[PDB]
Symmetry: C3
């Protein structure tokens, strides 16, 4: 039950040892799919429009297809609002941004 | 420290050995745990309608709840946009989506 | 080759042993890592209003920054309608969700 002679015996099997050992590398590989999941957030945006946002329980699909290219515009939605054309403007936006929280702070 | 006698001796514990010798299978189970999140994406859809569209700080509650069952319909939402009725028509839809780049590429 | 004197030899390295022996705890941490991703669903809701939803290929952003504080309100849409201040009221929701199935059934 577990020993130097036992571990070294696995290399002679050339069958179970692959699964038994490759599992260690497989652990890190498993961790990989989780990071993959963040793209789904992008998929939900496409999914919302592509099939229908409100409870679906189909002509709008032709128009929904623009969301394909929408990946580019989507990143721009956040960037164009903060700075708008020039980046120096972002600094200006940064000051008002702090000012807006003060206004909404008290209902 | 650590040997045939040490590993076998641990069996006398009858408590730690279970958690220590079952985590290995549990590692693969973690992979199952993360794949569970994929269904969670439907929850966001429910949450978006059930939260009141844009954060606003309602009959929609009764209808939004049945989105519970709507999860079944949600999988169908994608199937209905892509194929429509039969699983043959979808071959054509696959073509128009790729074709859309051509239509949207001009001008 | 795995042995009493072999395992204890790793501590002398004071380098690889940390990475080699800390991955085991890290596997459990990965479990924490996958659950971390769920908050992104919350971010997506924020993003929906903040960047837009329908294929978006100056006045709009000042209002959207209101959503900054809106994060607090965002969690309240679900909590207030679902439970309504006290938990005793949540029991009403508990019964309402079951009966609600009867209503969407016919549609």
């Amino acid at each position: 039950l577990l020993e130097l002679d036992k571990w070294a015996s696995l290399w002679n099997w050339f069958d179970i040892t692959n699964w038994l050992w490759y599992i260690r590398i497989f652990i890190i590989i498993v961790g990989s799919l989780i990071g993959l999941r963040i793209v789904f957030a992008v998929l939900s945006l496409v999914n919302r429009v592509r099939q229908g946002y409100s409870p679906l329980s189909e002509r709008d699909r032709d128009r929904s297809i623009r969301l394909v290219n929408g990946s580019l515009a989507l990143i721009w939605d956040d960037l164009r609002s903060l700075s708008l054309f020039s980046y120096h403007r972002l600094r200006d936006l940064l000051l008002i941004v702090t000012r807006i929280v003060e206004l909404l702070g008290r209902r």
